[PDB]
């Protein structure tokens, strides 16, 4: 019935899937920021 309706697995799995996405975007965001920072430059 109420087998944890929060299977930590599914919740952990989603959170895991979320962490993976953040990790992948992390360097892109940092690179993007550096690039945006280097690409953006004023003018």
């Amino acid at each position: 019935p109420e087998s944890p309706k929060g299977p930590d697995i599914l919740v952990v799995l989603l959170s895991v899937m979320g962490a993976i996405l953040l990790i992948g975007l992390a360097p892109l965001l940092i690179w993007a920021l550096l690039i945006t920072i280097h690409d953006r430059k004023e003018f």
Side-chain angles (χ1 to χ4, degrees):
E2 96 319 306
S3 156
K5 134 243 285 24
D8 292 310
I9 307 167
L10 278 166
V11 175
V12 172
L13 196 68
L14 289 167
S15 60
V16 167
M17 254 173 65
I20 292 168
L21 228 79
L22 202 70
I23 291 168
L25 292 155
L28 286 156
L29 288 165
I30 292 168
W31 172 223
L33 270 156
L34 288 171
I35 283 297
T36 307
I37 292 259
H38 283 97
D39 191 307
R40 199 219 76 90
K41 152 152 73 341
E42 194 168 344
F43 319 141

